[PDB]
Amino acid sequence: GLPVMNTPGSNQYLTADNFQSPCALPEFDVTPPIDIPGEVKNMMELAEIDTMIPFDLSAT
Amino acid sequence: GLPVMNTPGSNQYLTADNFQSPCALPEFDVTPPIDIPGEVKNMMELAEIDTMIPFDLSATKKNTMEMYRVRLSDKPHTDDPILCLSLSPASDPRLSHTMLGEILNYYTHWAGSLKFTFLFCGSMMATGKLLVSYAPPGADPPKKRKEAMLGTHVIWDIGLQSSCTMVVPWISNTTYRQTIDDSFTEGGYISVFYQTRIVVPLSTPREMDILGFVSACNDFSVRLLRDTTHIEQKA
Amino acid sequence: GLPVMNTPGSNQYLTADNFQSPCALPEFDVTPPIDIPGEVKNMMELAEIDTMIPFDLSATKKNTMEMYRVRLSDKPHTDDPILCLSLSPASDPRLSHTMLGEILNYYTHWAGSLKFTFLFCGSMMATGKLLVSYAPPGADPPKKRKEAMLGTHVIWDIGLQSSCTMVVPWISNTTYRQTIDDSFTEGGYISVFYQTRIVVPLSTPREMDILGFVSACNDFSVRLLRDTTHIEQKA
Amino acid sequence: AAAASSST
Amino acid sequence: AAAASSST
Amino acid sequence: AAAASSST
Amino acid sequence: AAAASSST
Amino acid sequence: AAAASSST
Amino acid sequence: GAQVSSQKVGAHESTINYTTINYYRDSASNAASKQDFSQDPSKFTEPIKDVLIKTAPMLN
Amino acid sequence: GAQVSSQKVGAHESTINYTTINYYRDSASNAASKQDFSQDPSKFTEPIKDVLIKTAPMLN
Amino acid sequence: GAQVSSQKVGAHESTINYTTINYYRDSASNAASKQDFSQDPSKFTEPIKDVLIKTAPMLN
Amino acid sequence: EACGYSDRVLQLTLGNSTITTQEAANSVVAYGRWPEYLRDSEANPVDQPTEPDVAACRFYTLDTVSWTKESRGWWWKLPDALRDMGLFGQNMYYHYLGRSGYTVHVQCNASKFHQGALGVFAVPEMCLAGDSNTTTMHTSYQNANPGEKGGTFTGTFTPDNNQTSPARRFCPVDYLLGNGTLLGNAFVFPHQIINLRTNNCATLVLPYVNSLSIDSMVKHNNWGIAILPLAPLNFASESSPEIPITLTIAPMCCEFNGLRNITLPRLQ
Amino acid sequence: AATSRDALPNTEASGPTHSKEIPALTAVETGATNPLVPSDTVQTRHVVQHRSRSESSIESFFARGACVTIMTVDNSASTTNKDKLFAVWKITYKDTVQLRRKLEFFTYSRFDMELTFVVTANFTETNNGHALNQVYQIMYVPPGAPVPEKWDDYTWQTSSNPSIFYTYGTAPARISVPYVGISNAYSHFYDGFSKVPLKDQSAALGDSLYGAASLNDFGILAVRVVNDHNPTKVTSKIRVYLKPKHIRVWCPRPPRAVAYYGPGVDYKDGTLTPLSTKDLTTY
Amino acid sequence: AATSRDALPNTEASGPTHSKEIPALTAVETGATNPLVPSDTVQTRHVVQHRSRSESSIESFFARGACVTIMTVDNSASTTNKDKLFAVWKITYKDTVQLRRKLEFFTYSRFDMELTFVVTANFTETNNGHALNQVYQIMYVPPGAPVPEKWDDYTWQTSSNPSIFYTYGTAPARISVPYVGISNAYSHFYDGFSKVPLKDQSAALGDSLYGAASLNDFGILAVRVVNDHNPTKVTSKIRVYLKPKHIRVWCPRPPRAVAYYGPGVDYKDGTLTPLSTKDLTTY
Ligand SMILES: CCCCCCCCCCCCC/C=C\[C@H](O)[C@H](N)CO
Ligand SMILES: CCCCCCCCCCCCC/C=C\[C@H](O)[C@H](N)CO
Ligand SMILES: *C(=O)CCCCCCCCCCCCC
Ligand SMILES: *C(=O)CCCCCCCCCCCCC
Ligand SMILES: *C(=O)CCCCCCCCCCCCC
């Protein structure tokens, strides 16, 4: 086999990682998308919408 | 999968290694740099700056402002030394805590030429000629102007140009010297003498100070990074 | 990650391996080479140099300067041997500690032609003819000039050219011989005889020494690196 | 190789 | 390389 | 490949 | 690459 | 690739 | 089949690249590329039939 | 996407090279190249408004 | 950056090759190539000022 | 110069103020960077900046201090030392953010028969050490910002012990630059030496330095000016000589962001 | 264009001199350092220089993992007065002294960060019981996120915080982090306060620590043993190694000469005499 | 252009001779070795030579990891009279004899170094307790750096020294080191002193060891067990294997013929009779 040397980080699980992995349902026939209205691409789009301020948080 | 064979060194952690590793904050919006003044690219840049030598580490003067002052006077000519210094830039107590000495204690080896500049802080009315010497190792360390004279030196004449620089040229058997006291890589002797004497008129102070500075020349380098002994954390 | 499958040999440490490994001192400023005289590229270069044979390992002479001296004399002709030697360059006690023998004890196998040079150290007034023989293995080892004569030999005439070289040609069944005493790879017999006799005038010494040297020819090689038995560390 | 390697 | 890389 | 491999 | 990749 | 692959 | 893309470089030590190869047949096995597009918030922030000009009166 | 560079060879057994490939999208994941630049100390050693000539009087 | 060389083939089952790639920046990390040169023993076997002809008298 | 000009003789003019000197030892520009205004590429606050120009970028002279045989040294912080200086201080307190560079001119003349040497150091982020050994990072804002009058070095660390009601102030030992590092190495910082036989002034041009393009001037000091006697004052034979040191400082290319009501700091 | 590993300048041959050029005389009052080389004051021969400053570049100086903290956790049975021990550490380079001293040669810095984790465990009692192999969870809790109160509360779900699940006995864990500062550079020193004391407002309110900026810079690391406890008790330690990669630094400072005393520049009594006795005229 | 693995010269056919050329006669007094080949003194046939000197090249001769030292450490509870045991070793090739002998065939050498570490552990008592898997730290302390005094003191932070953290049971650890000499080559032999005894100065001061150059050549390796101690005691040994790669050698020497006795060329009484009895005329 090809000579290799395991580096640190090996066998760990970083929850923020981004690797490939084997598929458990090979050749599955995926249902296509339809054009649903209201798609969002970035959370900041929502921040740009006006929402009402609870100014009076007094006890009663 | 691709046939592979684990070699020695596998799963180890070398603290001096240089590998890639997964990022814990993907797509993070990095704050850009601005153009801050005073950027440094190499630790040797700092070694080339002059810093003041604590020449007088005598018991009552050490760890005080006095340690930086070499006192002279208008006394009659003598061939005895004003100061004596070993060229051990990292280990000699007088050089070990200068900025040059400090950087040198993070490395095992040094090489290159050094330069000592002396500043006369007496009055404008004071005059004098001094001799600054460097003796490469291997003989009796100079104790008298007569011996000191025979090696590398500069006769400094005090006047408008306040200061004088003596260059200690790289003269070594080895290609690099160690940053510790060691006979095999010993560097020699720096010493200062009165050439004539300090002369003042009346109404003038008869004693005054000189200050000394050391910095590295452009041919100076260091290698084999190491931990310093100049800081610790007992408990 | 890329699918991989660990093969046998994984995580092992072969001392004869040849892999890369991380550097512990990154960016270290290496001191350059200078052109030192006497560089060697192959251990066989050393085997080609003549070194003196300890021919006389007799009990009182061994481990002393005497072991190097083969004493001759002006005595009357005889067909009896001056010396007898087995061609076992690594194992025979007389050859095993010569530089050739020493290098051969770091290898399991040897092959090639060897050459024995003899130096006459008697006086200029001494004359003589000697016969140096090599008998390939398989018959009665020569004990008399008559037998010795029938194989590979040189009749050496003593004169101005002080020394004489006999080449022992590579004659073997096997392609390589073992560096140990072994019948299957036995090499034969070296022996020296008086062809006529040593003759001196009066007022001249009647006994004298010859010295012998062995070195490898340019067709000589060794293989299968191994540890030697000529050094150890009991405790 | 030219095609394979697509680049972005 | 051209040939190797076959593509489908 | 030409482009990919940058070299320094 | 052309040369490397020998093919049989 | 041509350059990379040096060959000996 | 290697895919080469450039990293948006944060703190610096030409453009730097990284390389990706897909090992699996199913696209579900693929890592996330993060090469995503932004859209404008209009459909949420301004869902009005008549286009609005911000310097003019919203109501006229 | 491979990057080829040359090693400054210390003790010898043409130029020798080594090869690097970046596996991650984030430049923070990259190893250190060590291909660094030097600068001149002027801004610290000679921060004076008037350029200095070493053979002439520092003060005139 | 791959380096291709040929093996001197011992017992056989064209020339056969093997491939090497350096992974590290420091040449000290490199394996040994074993592609070594031989020299002639002259400087040790014949260090004499006057060149020697083997068929002629060493001393004349 | 064959037509007269020299290193030792300078004239500086900023606004309605001119300084002359006949005994300078050149000028220093810190890290070789001249003061400048904030560039668009590096800008951060989006509002139109206030730029006071001649009204604030002029020479303000602070209180003259006195050098003697017992002086251990003096320090000041910028912008703090200028907080009450005319229209500079006003623009400073009316805005949340501000940035400035400075020309620092230290003045100290004497005579051909005096001697002594002052080290003048401009230190970026000059954090000084406190007087307490039972708690750290505890010097109070009032104690940390002396304003124009500055503070001084001591030759001895003497720990505040009134634990009930602590001094809460700096205790800067001179040979340690008041910050735990040796004075002999302060020369890696932009500096000049006033050596009485050579010169009577020090001039340093300081750029705005920070890890931010602009910041709170009221909360944060960018530069420290430290003046320490490298070689002690001495004259003729008088056991008690004295000579004055005057500090004159000019804000340079200063600009302010985030206008509101005036900040009225509790400074006592 | 000059690189850290280029050879340094050659020495040039120089002969006798008798002139008005005065390299040796200077005036340090100016603030400058005399740029002299040996051929200025002595007769030099010619030397082809091979040495380089490769290893003293800023990257090369800091290219080492350094220990910044040791975290202790365990795996015992949580009981009414004492709980199973998880650990919380506020990220900093100032809990240890060696790397802190190196970074503080400079006022400001910029770098990507490489964190490597070494995990070691042992048996605390003269028992005989055993423990199956432990898995550790290292969660990064940035300032604002719910800090864990129990080894097993809801926060360890880490839906958005980055976590590392480390298996004991495997190669030490490692991740990289970008330059995450809210400034354009990290400030090793901050000469100021995070609060302006306002006259009009009461003093107690105006107050804050000298030299401290945001109370919680970079948040915390929270480590736990995921395994339910064994009858036998096992204690584990997590050593964190920090390496600055792709680093830039600005405004050089004199190195720390006396023992660190807290996160600031403060120094403690009785630690202020570093230099030792050595007479003026003694080699 | 001739490479270590090229075939050696062919034997050429040669016939009878009757001439004045005298290959066989020579004079070794000259200092030379007679370059004769078999066709010079006997009738040879023609032979196409296949053998090569590939395996006896300098690289090939030294291309083996060799044991240079065994280090012992343990993991017990540090108690008032006896402490947890960490190990310190001064780097050298002279603590063992086999590689030392091989290197000393030459006066000077140059090479990169490959160090491989084999770690083995065991239980020292007839206990029954256990120990979880150990992690070892191998720190390189170069001459000048703080040598560790305790298994756990501040020096093990390794902010600048290179350290290896080895996990037990994984493949043996390995690193490479460049040619680190302060000379242009390593000196296997140094005929001199590191100090000139000066008349004028007292003898005790002038003194130094014969053949020793810098008191501390290459510094030391310091090894420890990172784990806190178990109740049960485990002893571990670290075997260090050294391999010279990319090696060059100069000035050949006769090999060591009698037992080594110290770091120098000294020999001890009673070890000086290596050769054995064998009579002059006995095959
Ligand atoms: C799963 C592991 C994630 C680990 C995430 C760590 C992110 C936080 C990085 C800490 C940044 C610290 C930089 C050092 C200190 C600052 O330089 C000084 N206080 C000056 O600003
Ligand atoms: C984390 C592991 C780092 C290990 C670092 C080892 C660096 C030091 C290398 C030792 C060099 C020894 C070379 C041998 C000896 C010299 O040849 C002789 N005394 C002659 O000079
Ligand atoms: C396009 O991919 C052509 C180039 C291929 C480069 C080498 C690929 C490395 C090994 C990939 C094997 C794939 C495993 C499923
Ligand atoms: C540029 O990279 C084109 C050449 C690709 C060569 C083979 C790459 C080896 C496998 C890399 C896979 C990347 C893993 C994220
Ligand atoms: C020259 O090297 C160009 C061809 C690259 C071929 C693929 C290399 C295989 C992966 C190497 C990564 C290097 C690891 C430091």
M81 contacts B34 by C-beta, under 8 angstroms: no
Nearest to C152 by CA among B77, K14, N38, M159: N38
**Dihedral sign (CA L89, L90, L94, L97):** negative
Across the interface, do K59 and C42 touch by the CB < 8 Å criterion?
Answer: no
E7 lines ligand 3 (CB under 6 A): no
- Spell out which residues of chain K touch residue H8, defining contact as CB-CB under 8 Å: 3-6, 35
What amino acid occupies position F4? A
What amino acid occupies position B58? S
Strand duo C4-6 + N106-123: pairing? unpaired
Copy the structure tokens of residue N53: 């000197």
Nearest to C120 by CA among C157, C174, C171: C157
Chain I CA closest to residue C2: I23
Q: State the Cα–Cα distance between residues N80 and N61, nearest whole angstrom.
A: 50
Dmax (CA) of chain N: 91
First-to-last C-alpha distance (Å) of chain L: 53
Nearest to N70 by CA among N50, N52, N53, N87: N87
Q: State the Cα–Cα distance between residues N222 and C63, nearest whole angstrom.
A: 43
Q: State the Cα–Cα distance between residues M136 and L218, nearest whole angstrom.
A: 46
| Structural domain for M276, as ranges | 1-283
What amino acid occupies position B104? L
H3 touching K (Cβ < 8 Å): no
Check which CATH number belongs to the domain holding N92 and give it: 2.60.120.20
Chain I CA closest to residue J30: I18
Q: State the Cα–Cα distance between residues B216 and A3, nearest whole angstrom.
A: 46
Q: State the Cα–Cα distance between residues K34 and K8, nearest whole angstrom.
A: 12
Query: Using alpha carbons only, what angle is made at residue C35 by residues C33 and C38, rounded to the nearest 5 degrees?
Result: 120
Partner L, chain M 82-111, Cβ-Cβ below 8 Å:
107-108
Nearest to L208 by CA among L88, L92, L90, L78: L78
What is the three-class DSSP state of M222?
strand
Taking any CB pair shorter than 8 Å as contact, residues of chain B touching chain A are 2-11, 13, 17, 19, 21-26
Rounded to an integer, what is the distance from CA C153 to the centroid of its chain? 18
Phi, psi (rounded to 5 degrees) for C183: -50, -40
Copy the structure tokens of residue N168: 């037990």
Q: How many domains does chain M have?
A: 1
Partner I, chain M 172-231, Cβ-Cβ below 8 Å:
178-179
N114 contacts N65 by C-beta, under 8 angstroms: yes
Counting atoms of ligand 2 from 1, which one is nearest the CA of B14? 1
**Atom 11 (ligand 1) nearest CA:** M218
Strand duo F6-7 + J3-6: pairing? parallel
**Atom 1 (ligand 3) nearest CA:** I1
Q: How far is CA N74 from CA B28, B68, N223, in A?
A: 45, 49, 10
M99 lines ligand 1 (CB under 6 A): no
Strand duo L65-68 + L201-206: pairing? unpaired
**Atom 2 (ligand 5) nearest CA:** K1
Nearest to C221 by CA among N9, N35, K37: N9
Nearest to C28 by CA among J16, K28, N133: K28
Q: State the Cα–Cα distance between residues N107 and N251, nearest whole angstrom.
A: 5
B132 contacts B81 by C-beta, under 8 angstroms: no
Q: State the Cα–Cα distance between residues M93 and M103, nearest whole angstrom.
A: 9
Q: State the Cα–Cα distance between residues M93 and M102, nearest whole angstrom.
A: 11
**Atom 9 (ligand 4) nearest CA:** J21
Q: State the Cα–Cα distance between residues B64 and M238, nearest whole angstrom.
A: 43
| Residue among N8, N28, N29, N34 with most chain K CBs within 10 A, to mutate | N34
Task: List the domain boundaries for chain J.
Answer: 1-60
Peptide bond into L172 cis (omega under 30): no
DSSP state of M10: P
- Lining ligand 2 with CB less than 6 A are C 24; N 91, 93, 113, 115, 138, 140, 162, 164, 175, 177, 180, 186-188, 217-218
Across the interface, do M128 and N132 touch by the CB < 8 Å criterion?
Answer: no
Q: State the Cα–Cα distance between residues C142 and C150, nearest whole angstrom.
A: 10
Query: Using alpha carbons only, what angle is made at residue L130 by residues L129 and L132, rounded to the nearest 5 degrees?
Result: 135
L97 contacts L254 by C-beta, under 8 angstroms: no
Q: State the Cα–Cα distance between residues M32 and M29, nearest whole angstrom.
A: 8
Strand duo C83-86 + C152-157: pairing? unpaired
Chain K CA closest to residue C30: K28
**Atom 3 (ligand 1) nearest CA:** M140
Q: State the Cα–Cα distance between residues L260 and C76, nearest whole angstrom.
A: 130
Partner I, chain A 13-52, Cβ-Cβ below 8 Å:
18-23, 25-28, 37-39, 41-42, 45-46, 48-50
Copy the structure tokens of residue N209: 């060891």
J8 touching N (Cβ < 8 Å): no
What is the three-class DSSP state of N56?
helix
Q: State the Cα–Cα distance between residues M241 and N160, nearest whole angstrom.
A: 12
DSSP state of L173: B
Distance from Cα M164 to the centre of ligand 4, integer Å: 26
- Spell out which residues of chain M touch residue L25, defining contact as CB-CB under 8 Å: 27, 29-31
Give chain C's domains with CATH numbers. 1-235 (2.60.120.20)
What is the three-class DSSP state of C107?
strand
Nearest to B86 by CA among M37, M36, M281, M277: M281
B189 contacts M53 by C-beta, under 8 angstroms: no
Q: I1-60, what's its fold?
A: Rhinovirus 14, subunit 4 (4.10.80)
N95 contacts N71 by C-beta, under 8 angstroms: no
Q: State the Cα–Cα distance between residues C164 and C154, nearest whole angstrom.
A: 9
β-pair partners for B214: B51, B116
Q: State the Cα–Cα distance between residues M142 and M243, nearest whole angstrom.
A: 20
Distance from Cα B19 to the centre of ligand 5, integer Å: 14
B171 contacts M47 by C-beta, under 8 angstroms: no
Q: How was this structure determined?
A: X-ray
Nearest to B55 by CA among B65, B43, B45: B65
E runs forming strands in C140-228 = 152-157, 163-168, 177-178, 189-194, 207-216, 221-225
Q: Residue N98 is inside which H or E element, if any?
A: helix N98-103
Torsion of CA B194, B199, B203, B205, to 10 degrees: -10
Q: Can you spell out the DSSP letters for chain B?
A: -EEEEEPTTTT-EETT------BSSTT--PPPP---S-EESBHHHHHTS-EE----B-TTTTTSGGGG-EEEE-PPP--S-SEEEE--TTTSTTTTTSHHHHHHTTEEEEES-EEEEEEE-S-TT-B-EEEEEEE-SSSPPP-SHHHHHTSEEEEEEPSSS-EEEEEE----SSSSEESS--GGG---EEEEEESS--B--TTS-SEEEEEEEEEE-TT-EEEEE---SS-----
Phi, psi (rounded to 5 degrees) for L247: -100, 120
For chains I and L, tell me whether 3 or more CB atom pairs sit within 8 A of each other: no
What is the three-class DSSP state of M257?
coil
What amino acid occupies position L25? A
Nearest to B53 by CA among B21, B89, B77: B89
Distance from Cα M213 to the centre of ligand 1, integer Å: 14
Q: State the Cα–Cα distance between residues B64 and L182, nearest whole angstrom.
A: 10
Resolution in A: 2.9
Phi-psi region of C128 (alpha: psi -120 to 50; beta: other; left: phi over 0): left
Locus of tokens 């340079």: L252
What is the three-class DSSP state of M41?
coil
Q: State the Cα–Cα distance between residues M163 and M226, nearest whole angstrom.
A: 12
Copy the structure tokens of residue M176: 């990289």
Distance from Cα M180 to the centre of ligand 1, integer Å: 7
Q: State the Cα–Cα distance between residues B152 and B168, nearest whole angstrom.
A: 8
Return the exposure string of M81-90: e unless at least 16 CB atoms fall within 10 Å of the residue's CB, then b.
Answer: eeebbbbbbe
Q: Can you spell out the DSSP letters for M93-162?
A: S-SSSHHHHHHTTEEEEEEEEEEEEEEEEEE-SS-----PPPEEEEEEE-TTS---SSTTSGGGG-SSS-
K23 contacts B7 by C-beta, under 8 angstroms: no
M222 lines ligand 1 (CB under 6 A): no
Helix ranges restricted to H, M35-97: 58-62
Nearest to N133 by CA among N121, N150, N151: N121
Query: Which H, E and C letters describe B153-176, residue by residue?
Result: EEEEECCCCCEEEEEECCCCCCCC
I4 lines ligand 3 (CB under 6 A): no
Give chain L's domains with CATH numbers. 1-268 (2.60.120.20)
Chain pair J-N, CB pairs under 8 angstroms: 16
Across the interface, do B46 and J44 touch by the CB < 8 Å criterion?
Answer: yes
